[PDB]
Amino acid sequence: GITKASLATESFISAASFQETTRVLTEAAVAGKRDELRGLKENVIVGRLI
């Protein structure tokens, strides 16, 4: 379901910026989930081009 595929996405900052924060950020923090951008919401956050 969407409300999940959101969460488990490759990226995280999106999830972080969607529907809840703590769950995602924590799971990341233990994952050491190095994260590329490769995504609109991402670059929007960092504000470079899309």
Partner: protein, 201 residues
């Protein structure tokens, strides 16, 4: 018209054509002056007749009930169905006497034709309103549904041209408030759906 215009001659001519459409439209529209007056909504002569006949039918079913031939349930159901039939008859009557009433000589004697009663014009145009709305102006405005989703056993006799008696208007009130309230909660849940979708794609 506009659409085929596009698909056949590209884009620039299409847009310039659209703006010319609007110009010439407003122009001749004003130049015409399609107003709306009270006299412009004809009450069907047969309306009184038909609704009286319906009243008599209601009385007949009421006699059947009081004589124990039917239970209140099918009583309710019979009554509603027959009122609905009556409603449709009235709708046919009004739509006829509007769309055609214009009947005039030709240098001969007479002939009927499509009307010019501004309200039917505004409808058949397709500007706003339709058979439905012109109905709720001329004929009865059908039946109204209580919050139960049930439907009241006594319809709106009259229309907007005539005056609604209190109880009627009071009914149609919640009839409409239901949706007028609904729209808020609806908007909310819809927006949530939208957001969720955007953050899946």
């Amino acid at each position: 018209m506009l659409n085929t215009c596009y698909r056949i001659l590209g884009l620039k001519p299409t847009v310039i054509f659209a703006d010319q459409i609007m110009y010439t439209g407003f122009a001749y529209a004003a130049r015409s002056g399609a107003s709306v007056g009270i006299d412009d909504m004809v009450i069907p002569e047969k309306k009184h007749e038909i609704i009286s006949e319906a009243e008599a039918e209601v009385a007949e079913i009421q006699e059947q009930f009081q004589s124990g031939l039917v239970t209140a349930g099918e009583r309710y159901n019979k009554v509603i169905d027959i009122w609905a039939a009556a409603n449709d008859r009235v709708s046919k009557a009004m739509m006829d006497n509007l769309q055609t009433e214009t009947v005039i000589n030709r240098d001969g004697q007479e002939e009927k034709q499509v009307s010019f009663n501004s309200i039917y014009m505004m409808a058949d145009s397709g500007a706003r309103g339709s058979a439905a709305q012109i109905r709720q102006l001329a004929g009865m405005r059908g039946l109204m549904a209580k919050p139960d989703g049930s439907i009241i056993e006594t319809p709106i006799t009259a229309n907007f041209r005539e005056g609604l008696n209190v109880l009627q208007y009071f009914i149609s009130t919640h009839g409409a408030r239901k949706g007028l309230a609904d729209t808020a909660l609806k908007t909310a849940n819809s927006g949530y759906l939208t957001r969720r979708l955007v953050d899946v794609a």
